Design an enzyme around this catalytic site. Structure first.
Site, short mmCIF file in Angstrom:
data_model
loop_
_atom_site.label_atom_id
_atom_site.label_comp_id
_atom_site.label_asym_id
_atom_site.label_seq_id
_atom_site.Cartn_x
_atom_site.Cartn_y
_atom_site.Cartn_z
N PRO B 40 0.82 -1.22 0.00
CA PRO B 40 0.00 0.00 0.00
C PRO B 40 0.85 1.26 0.00
O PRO B 40 1.95 1.29 0.56
CB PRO B 40 -0.81 -0.12 1.30
CG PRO B 40 -0.02 -1.02 2.17
CD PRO B 40 1.03 -1.73 1.36
N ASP B 41 0.33 2.29 -0.65
CA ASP B 41 0.96 3.61 -0.65
C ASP B 41 0.28 4.43 0.44
O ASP B 41 -0.91 4.75 0.33
CB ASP B 41 0.84 4.29 -2.01
CG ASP B 41 1.41 5.71 -2.01
OD1 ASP B 41 1.89 6.17 -0.96
OD2 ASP B 41 1.38 6.36 -3.07
N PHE B 42 1.03 4.77 1.48
CA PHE B 42 0.44 5.52 2.59
C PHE B 42 0.14 6.97 2.22
O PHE B 42 -0.72 7.59 2.85
CB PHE B 42 1.37 5.47 3.80
CG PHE B 42 1.21 4.23 4.61
CD1 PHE B 42 1.73 3.02 4.18
CD2 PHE B 42 0.53 4.25 5.82
CE1 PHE B 42 1.59 1.88 4.92
CE2 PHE B 42 0.38 3.11 6.56
CZ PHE B 42 0.91 1.92 6.11
N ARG B 43 0.82 7.52 1.21
CA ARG B 43 0.51 8.87 0.77
C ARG B 43 -0.86 8.94 0.12
O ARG B 43 -1.57 9.94 0.24
CB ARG B 43 1.59 9.36 -0.21
CG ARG B 43 3.00 9.39 0.37
CD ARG B 43 3.20 10.55 1.33
NE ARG B 43 3.14 11.84 0.65
CZ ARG B 43 3.26 13.01 1.27
NH1 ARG B 43 3.45 13.06 2.58
NH2 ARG B 43 3.19 14.14 0.58
N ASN B 112 11.13 3.11 -0.22
CA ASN B 112 10.28 2.00 0.19
C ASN B 112 10.99 1.15 1.23
O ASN B 112 12.22 1.05 1.25
CB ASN B 112 9.90 1.13 -1.02
CG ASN B 112 9.16 1.90 -2.11
OD1 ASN B 112 8.69 3.01 -1.88
ND2 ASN B 112 9.04 1.30 -3.29
N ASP B 114 9.75 -2.15 1.76
CA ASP B 114 9.12 -3.45 1.55
C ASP B 114 10.10 -4.58 1.19
O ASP B 114 9.68 -5.74 1.14
CB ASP B 114 8.04 -3.35 0.46
CG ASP B 114 8.54 -2.68 -0.81
OD1 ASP B 114 9.67 -2.99 -1.25
OD2 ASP B 114 7.78 -1.86 -1.37
N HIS B 131 14.74 5.30 3.51
CA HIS B 131 13.76 5.30 4.58
C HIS B 131 13.89 4.06 5.46
O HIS B 131 12.97 3.74 6.22
CB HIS B 131 12.36 5.42 3.99
CG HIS B 131 11.99 6.82 3.60
ND1 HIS B 131 10.75 7.16 3.12
CD2 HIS B 131 12.71 7.97 3.63
CE1 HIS B 131 10.70 8.46 2.87
NE2 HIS B 131 11.88 8.98 3.18
C1 LIG Z 1 9.63 -7.53 4.53
O1 LIG Z 1 8.95 -7.49 5.78
C2 LIG Z 1 7.76 -6.82 5.86
C3 LIG Z 1 7.37 -5.81 5.01
C4 LIG Z 1 6.13 -5.19 5.19
C5 LIG Z 1 5.27 -5.56 6.20
C6 LIG Z 1 3.93 -4.87 6.37
N1 LIG Z 1 3.97 -3.61 5.62
C7 LIG Z 1 3.66 -3.63 4.29
N2 LIG Z 1 3.70 -2.60 3.50
C8 LIG Z 1 4.07 -1.44 4.12
S1 LIG Z 1 4.20 0.07 3.27
C9 LIG Z 1 4.69 0.89 4.72
C10 LIG Z 1 4.75 0.07 5.79
C11 LIG Z 1 4.40 -1.29 5.45
C12 LIG Z 1 4.36 -2.46 6.29
O2 LIG Z 1 4.62 -2.48 7.49
C13 LIG Z 1 5.16 0.59 7.15
C14 LIG Z 1 5.73 2.01 7.11
C15 LIG Z 1 4.93 2.91 6.17
N3 LIG Z 1 5.39 4.31 6.20
C16 LIG Z 1 4.97 4.96 7.44
C17 LIG Z 1 5.34 6.42 7.46
C18 LIG Z 1 4.56 7.52 7.03
C19 LIG Z 1 3.18 7.50 6.44
N4 LIG Z 1 5.18 8.65 7.20
O3 LIG Z 1 6.43 8.31 7.78
C20 LIG Z 1 6.49 6.97 7.92
C21 LIG Z 1 7.73 6.41 8.50
C22 LIG Z 1 4.98 2.36 4.75
C23 LIG Z 1 5.66 -6.60 7.10
C24 LIG Z 1 4.83 -7.03 8.17
C25 LIG Z 1 5.24 -8.04 9.01
C26 LIG Z 1 6.46 -8.65 8.84
C27 LIG Z 1 7.30 -8.27 7.82
C28 LIG Z 1 6.93 -7.24 6.93
#
Ligand SMILES: COc1ccc(Cn2cnc3sc4c(c3c2=O)CC[C@@H](NCc2c(C)noc2C)C4)c2ccccc12
Ligand SMILES: [Zn+2]
Ligand SMILES: [Zn+2]
Lengths: 298, 300
Positions: B40-43, B112, B114, B131
């Site tokens: 997902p794109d949080f923006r 990213n 991810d 990031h």
């Molecule tokens: C490779 O292992 C993993 C990758 C991703 C996820 C779950 N998963 C998926 N996709 C996304 S995309 C995204 C986040 C996120 C996320 O946790 C978390 C941080 C977000 N950004 C926050 C933010 C904002 C808005 N402004 O500043 C900040 C800092 C952007 C995982 C969950 C459990 C275990 C491993 C994971």
């Protein structure tokens, strides 16, 4: 009248032949020895299953016993799952063979799916003992198919996989004792073995079918390189040692002309062969990249 | 002003890339290259709906370091909910692996977290995770800072146990950059060397609104072309001053003085296919994607 395609019965001779224009189609025959370095046990060579009271140890791989008592199989499968499914250098050597336009087919008797994880696709593959990649409900009327992701979830949860439609047992598409070999094996065999220029036999001791009989069906002039911990295929599957008559592997006799044994681990043989071909750096680069991609998940 | 492109189009960039002058390409990539992978794109909605029971002061508080340190449960709740299952990199990710394999990739900078760049086969030396990343985690205590691998952090999140350091029992945090944290030291060490040597800036799937990319885009050499592959034009305004005709190195696609900036508007995957076509790499790219996707499907 028999044609002598190797200039010497050594890995160097095999490499020079692979570089010649006559070597256009290579078939790989691979067994458990190409996956031991990935953490899969060498099934050529139960202690945790004493509680299950099997009549004999092989009963957990017998289709009729499995249908009425499946728990020991899935329990053993739950245990034999390695920490991480990473294909070996030998697996990626075969992918290199494809890239270079030499792979006619990889026949495997392994069920660990590492050929596919290495990037070999279905068209390149004959899984001669089946695979975990797909499963089916045993009920003839249902036959609902399930993907490996669904099956892994059931095994790791220690939930005996039942069909979501009829609750009957779901079996992975591996060949249990008492089952026929895949139809794809027989069809591919007939076409492939008429035009194979080189047989690369890796990590199998050619005792189990169909490789035990298949090894001798190559054309009489087709060279055959064995990379294995021990020599193999010298005996007839049913008649034993009969000085190689009928197409057995003949490495050492006064009549040897085309068979080569390189004894050791499969990874080291593929690296040695890749070096003779000028492919070692390319192979090591591929393995590093693809291992990193998988390591990125842990 | 040296103009290195023969025309301000994708075709002009592709011809430049095939010239001897273009030896070192930097990619700057954001959330837009991972949305087709289910990240997902949080923006861009409803991501936080299941956190209502936590009574957050504001949704993004879960990513602010001080609030996280006292209330880590909401962040880990959301991470568990957003775990995609399989991680399958996009055509755009594999295009960057092709650039690497062809000896043109100086560096991929990503905003990213991810890990899809690593899953696509880019190695740490190729990557600046500007990031941070989920790939590694660290105890938050300054006197300990024990590192933990992704397998450890996954097991804790899926077990719904708040991760705690095995040495000092302090909170363990994935190496994502939270609000209030500095950017990774690797970003600053690489930025200063890379942006002196870069022959082409390839900017894909980022709005260039958040830092560091917002400010970093204007630090390229004045003669270095910049190609934006994105749904919309971006990078034209100063991060604080707003529009200023592009003074200070802003992206200038359309003014009468434009000379080096090109925008191709569309999905990142589609733009990378069209660029690969103009480089003669499309077959290689499509074969790579098919093979690597088949492999990921096989890992299940
Ligand atoms: C490779 O292992 C993993 C990758 C991703 C996820 C779950 N998963 C998926 N996709 C996304 S995309 C995204 C986040 C996120 C996320 O946790 C978390 C941080 C977000 N950004 C926050 C933010 C904002 C808005 N402004 O500043 C900040 C800092 C952007 C995982 C969950 C459990 C275990 C491993 C994971
Ligand atoms: Zn059924
Ligand atoms: Zn600690």
């Amino acid at each position: 009248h028999m044609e002598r395609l190797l200039d010497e019965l050594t890995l160097e001779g095999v490499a020079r032949y692979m570089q010649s224009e006559r070597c256009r189609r290579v078939i790989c025959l691979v067994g458990a020895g190409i996956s031991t370095s990935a953490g899969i046990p060498d099934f050529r060579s139960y202690d945790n299953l004493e509680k299950y009271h099997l009549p004999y140890p092989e009963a957990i791989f017998e289709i009729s016993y499995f249908k009425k008592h499946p728990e020991p199989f899935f329990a053993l499968a739950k245990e034999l799952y390695p920490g991480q499914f990473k294909p070996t250098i030998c697996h990626y050597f075969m992918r290199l063979l494809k890239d270079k336009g030499l792979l006619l087919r990889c026949y495997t008797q392994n069920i660990d799916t590492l050929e596919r994880i290495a990037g070999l696709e279905q068209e390149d593959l004959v899984e001669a003992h089946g695979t975990f990649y797909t499963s089916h409900c045993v009920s003839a009327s249902c036959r609902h198919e399930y993907p490996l992701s669904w099956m892994k979830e059931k095994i790791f949860s220690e939930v005996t996989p039942k069909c979501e439609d009829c609750q009957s047992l779901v079996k992975p598409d591996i060949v249990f004792f008492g089952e026929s070999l895949p139809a794809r094996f027989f069809s591919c065999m007939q076409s492939d073995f008429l035009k194979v220029d080189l047989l690369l036999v890796m990590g199998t001791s050619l005792q189990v079918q169909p490789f035990a009989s298949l090894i001798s069906k190559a054309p009489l002039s087709t060279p055959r390189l064995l990379i294995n911990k021990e020599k193999a295929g010298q005996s007839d599957p049913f008649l034993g040692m009969i000085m190689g008559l009928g197409g057995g592997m003949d490495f050492d006799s006064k009549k040897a002309y085309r068979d080569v044994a390189w004894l050791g681990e499969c990874d080291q043989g593929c690296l040695a062969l890749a070096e003779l071909l000028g492919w070692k750096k390319e192979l090591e680069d591929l393995v590093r990249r693809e291992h990193a991609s998988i390591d990125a998940q842990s």
